Design a protein around this motif. Sequence first.
Motif, PDB file in Angstrom:
ATOM      1  N   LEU A  78       0.525  -1.534  -0.298  1.00 62.51           N
ATOM      2  CA  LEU A  78       0.103   0.451  -0.058  1.00 62.51           C
ATOM      3  C   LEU A  78       1.000   0.983   0.273  1.00 62.51           C
ATOM      4  CD1 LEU A  78      -0.530   1.406   2.745  1.00 62.51           C
ATOM      5  CD2 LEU A  78      -1.490  -0.915   3.979  1.00 62.51           C
ATOM      6  N   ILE A  79       2.418   1.193   0.074  1.00 62.61           N
ATOM      7  CA  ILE A  79       3.066   2.795   0.048  1.00 62.61           C
ATOM      8  C   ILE A  79       2.812   3.488  -1.145  1.00 62.61           C
ATOM      9  CG2 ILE A  79       5.136   3.086  -0.337  1.00 62.61           C
ATOM     10  CD1 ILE A  79       4.871   3.156   2.510  1.00 62.61           C
ATOM     11  N   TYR A  80       2.812   2.468  -2.325  1.00 61.26           N
ATOM     12  CA  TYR A  80       2.760   3.098  -3.906  1.00 61.26           C
ATOM     13  C   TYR A  80       1.295   3.710  -3.964  1.00 61.26           C
ATOM     14  CZ  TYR A  80       6.663   0.327  -4.238  1.00 61.26           C
ATOM     15  OH  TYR A  80       8.328  -0.608  -4.037  1.00 61.26           O
TER      16      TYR A  80
ATOM     17  N   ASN B 240      -2.072  10.331  -2.306  1.00 58.99           N
ATOM     18  CA  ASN B 240      -1.804  11.625  -1.616  1.00 58.99           C
ATOM     19  C   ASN B 240      -1.184  12.344  -2.585  1.00 58.99           C
ATOM     20  OD1 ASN B 240      -3.442   9.556   0.007  1.00 58.99           O
ATOM     21  ND2 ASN B 240      -2.199   9.735   1.701  1.00 58.99           N
ATOM     22  N   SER B 241      -0.825  11.876  -3.972  1.00 61.15           N
ATOM     23  CA  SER B 241       0.749  12.523  -4.121  1.00 61.15           C
ATOM     24  C   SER B 241      -0.708  14.787  -5.061  1.00 61.15           C
ATOM     25  CB  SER B 241      -0.033  12.242  -5.876  1.00 61.15           C
ATOM     26  OG  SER B 241       0.326  11.152  -6.139  1.00 61.15           O
ATOM     27  N   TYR B 242      -1.722  14.655  -4.363  1.00 60.79           N
ATOM     28  CA  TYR B 242      -2.251  15.781  -4.432  1.00 60.79           C
ATOM     29  C   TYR B 242      -1.613  17.274  -3.431  1.00 60.79           C
ATOM     30  CZ  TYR B 242      -4.588  15.522   0.115  1.00 60.79           C
ATOM     31  OH  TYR B 242      -5.104  15.260   1.200  1.00 60.79           O
ATOM     32  N   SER B 243      -0.734  16.121  -2.602  1.00 64.40           N
ATOM     33  CA  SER B 243      -0.358  17.338  -1.755  1.00 64.40           C
ATOM     34  C   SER B 243       0.813  17.866  -2.004  1.00 64.40           C
ATOM     35  CB  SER B 243       0.347  16.237  -0.114  1.00 64.40           C
ATOM     36  OG  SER B 243      -0.990  16.452   0.174  1.00 64.40           O
TER      37      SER B 243
END
Lengths: 57, 49
Positions: free
Chosen positions: A3-5, A11-14
């Motif tokens: 689940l890291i990837y 969450n890349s939006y941050s």
Amino acid sequence: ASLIYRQLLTNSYSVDLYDEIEQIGSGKTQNVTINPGPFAQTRYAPVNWDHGEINDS
Amino acid sequence: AQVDEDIIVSKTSLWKEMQYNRDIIIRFKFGNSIVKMGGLGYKWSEISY
């Protein structure tokens, strides 16, 4: 631990917030965009030297 | 004509401003003009630079 990837992608939006932060941090400059068109250098004039105004009487 | 009027004879160009600082030796000699006066030869009308 797969689940890291998934988490990073989700969450890349941050990174938008991170980009705003580094933009606020960074100093800024700018340009005064240069002019083309010095295609004709100009000489002074036809100049001839002579004695000034003699004050005769 | 009694009116304002402008044109442009040639487009822009580059000019540098520069310093030339030379030494100079100016030498010169004065000039004197002397002339008689109509008469016996005792009156001088003009003796001037």
